[PDB]
């Protein structure tokens, strides 16, 4: 055990000690390693730290790191690297942590150029990757096959390549919300091969319509909130039969095309709040759909914003003005 750093019940507590580098005196049989809330630099990692095989959980949040740390313990499953100033992600550093299952790179200055081509792909055991609040311009191409959750929210992402989600059949959750993403930015059939995907979130983005060619093999939740969606195509919600929760709130939708929720048989909840719904003969089907829909479906937000004669009233409570 180190001189300044304390250890209790096979847990190393180096946290809140203002350490410039990771200490040398790390015992052979330690469970969890705490090195958070310090001033540890990128060149403060000894080669002997990688030799320790007993450690599976390492905390390194709120440090002075600039790159992804090297010589980290070989058999680490969960790794926390949030609240620091990481900019560069190296292919060699992630090749060391072969048993890495969970990774947190939140609140950092990570960019597309900083991430080396196929750096994350090296981490073969990677199931959970949290790239929240970074300066990333696009989704990296070299991603792990065994990935189950990709949270790349609150970034500067505008484009998504067709090769970015290559071989990722095991991915269940994809959170790409709070980005500069557009429908032209996303490649044709980029999400199509995500068979095991259960949840999809793209809130606070600039999409003119929902992403085309989405798989409904295991998709349950679809979030299209706070977007610039003006229209929804007839084939968009089609082939998504297993969907339960849907959200189209806070968009620029004027009306909905007849037979859009026709294929959604397992639907349970729908939200369309804060949308400029123009109540005319275009929403006649919406009124009839809401009248015959079972109580199992929770539909909210269908209110008239125009014209003034219909304004304020709910679409479900309407009667028509036209044939």
């Amino acid at each position: 055990c180190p001189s300044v750093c304390r250890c209790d019940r096979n847990f190393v507590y180096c946290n809140e000690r203002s350490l410039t580098s990771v200490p040398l005196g790390i015992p052979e049989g330690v469970t969890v390693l705490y090195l958070h809330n310090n001033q540890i630099n990128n060149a403060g990692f000894p080669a002997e730290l990688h030799n320790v095989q007993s450690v599976h959980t390492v905390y390194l949040y709120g440090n002075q790191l600039d790159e992804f740390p090297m010589n980290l313990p070989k058999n680490v499953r969960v790794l926390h690297l949030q609240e620091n100033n990481i900019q560069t992600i190296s292919r060699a550093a992630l090749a060391q942590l072969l048993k890495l299952e969970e990774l947190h790179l939140d609140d950092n200055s990570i960019s597309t150029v900083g991430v080396e081509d196929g750096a994350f792909r090296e981490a073969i055991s990677l199931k959970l990757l949290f790239l929240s609040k970074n300066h990333l311009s696009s989704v990296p191409v070299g991603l792990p096959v065994d990935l189950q959750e990709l949270r790349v929210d609150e970034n500067r992402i505008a484009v998504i390549s067709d090769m970015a989600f290559q071989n990722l059949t095991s991915l269940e959750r994809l959170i790409v919300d709070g980005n500069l993403l557009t429908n032209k930015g996303i490649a044709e059939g980029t999400f199509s091969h995500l068979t095991k995907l259960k949840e999809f979130s793209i809130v606070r983005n600039s999409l003119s319509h929902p992403p085309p060619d989405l798989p409904g093999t295991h998709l349950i939740r679809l979030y299209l909130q706070d977007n610039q969606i003006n229209h929804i195509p007839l084939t968009a919600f089609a082939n998504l039969r297993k969907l339960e929760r849907l959200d189209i709130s806070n968009n620029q939708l004027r009306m909905l095309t007849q037979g859009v929720f026709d294929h959604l048989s397992n639907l349970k909840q729908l939200t369309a709040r804060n949308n400029p719904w123009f109540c005319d003969c275009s929403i006649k089907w919406v009124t009839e759909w809401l009248k015959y829909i079972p109580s199992s479906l929770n539909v909210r937000g269908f209110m008239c914003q125009g014209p003034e004669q219909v304004r304020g009233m709910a679409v479900r409570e309407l009667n028509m003005s036209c044939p």
């Binding site: 900019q87 200055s109 150029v113 609040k133 311009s137 609150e154 500067r156 709070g178 980005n179």
Partner: protein
């Protein structure tokens, strides 16, 4: 090379409700975005200026964002309302200082 800031956002005070503006200028820069309270500001809220430097063939980018009295009083965080400017170059990124925005009564 990485972007260097010519102008970093300054600490601003909202007096008599007039909405303040935060200024940011970096060279070389292809893209500049503001991040307020750990969240990226929408592109529509940014007023950008792209000019070719009279000195070198490098592109200079200047961006402004408006912060209202309502945005500050609606934000309920442990620390004061802050905005950071992030610049993008052909090879990397650079983050400016965190500029604080507080309401002040006369």
């Amino acid at each position: 090379t990485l972007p260097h800031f010519i102008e970093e956002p300054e600490d601003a005070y909202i007096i008599k409700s007039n909405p303040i503006a935060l200024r940011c200028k970096a060279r070389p820069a292809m893209q500049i975005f503001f991040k307020c309270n750990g969240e990226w500001v929408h592109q529509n809220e940014h007023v950008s200026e792209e000019s070719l430097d009279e000195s070198s063939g490098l592109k200079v980018r200047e961006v402004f964002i408006n912060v209202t009295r309502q945005q500050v009083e609606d934000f309920h965080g442990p620390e004061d309302y802050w905005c950071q400017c992030v610049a993008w170059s052909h090879l990397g990124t650079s983050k400016s200082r965190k500029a604080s925005v507080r309401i002040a009564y006369l």
